[PDB]
């Protein structure tokens, strides 16, 4: 869900009011899993190279495997946005126009 990290490094969820007043950008972050493999073969001239699996780095079992890749803007009232499930009193306390 959309959120912002200030210059102090503190992280707080970003809401449209703060983006409007403070000149921010309504957006969220994208996380992608990455896996790496290393293959080594003996280069014998005149013969095809036969590589074998030696090292495979895959951090799927830890939260460090999610590589941060960038930030994507979010359109209002879409599935991800907080406004999607807000009732009338929710919109008023957050001060939306119904």
């Amino acid at each position: 869900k959309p959120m912002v990290n200030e210059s102090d490094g503190v992280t707080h969820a970003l809401y449209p009011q703060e983006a409007r007043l403070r000149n921010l950008t309504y957006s969220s972050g994208l996380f992608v899993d990455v896996k790496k493999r290393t293959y080594e073969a003996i280069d014998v001239p005149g013969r095809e190279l036969k590589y074998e699996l030696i090292a495979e780095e895959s951090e799927d079992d830890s939260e460090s495997g999610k590589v941060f890749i960038g930030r994507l803007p979010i359109m209002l009232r879409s599935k991800n946005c907080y406004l999607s499930e807000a009732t009338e009193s929710d919109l008023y306390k957050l001060k939306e126009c119904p």
Binding site: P16, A19, R20, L21, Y92, K95, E96, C97
Partner: protein
């Protein structure tokens, strides 16, 4: 936006009658024309003032001048 105090055309005053006009509509379950004529609104300009009023003051009132979003 609260009801205009005076009529823009014939100078009459309609501001005070809004509260009593709203009463006749649901407590007495009358129609709009007879309710409008029950309060001495006879020129159709006064009927225009009362009949076509959008009361927007009850929406701003559930709200604060601080933190609207977009």
């Amino acid at each position: 936006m609260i009801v205009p105090v005076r009529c823009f055309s014939c100078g009459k005053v309609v501001g005070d009658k809004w509260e009593s006009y709203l009463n006749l509509l649901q407590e007495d379950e009358l129609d709009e024309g007879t309710a409008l004529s029950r309060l001495g609104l006879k020129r159709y300009c006064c009927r225009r003032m009362i009949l076509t009023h959008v009361d927007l003051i009850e929406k701003f009132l559930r709200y604060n001048p601080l933190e609207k979003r977009d």
